[PDB]
Amino acid sequence: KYACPECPKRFLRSDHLSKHIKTHXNKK
């Protein structure tokens, strides 16, 4: 839950990381 799973961006907020990975996840 904590820290990034695919990119060296590791903080301490799992749910900042949820919507970080919801970055890992929509692009326009």
Ligand SMILES: [Zn+2]
């Ligand atoms: Zn990341």
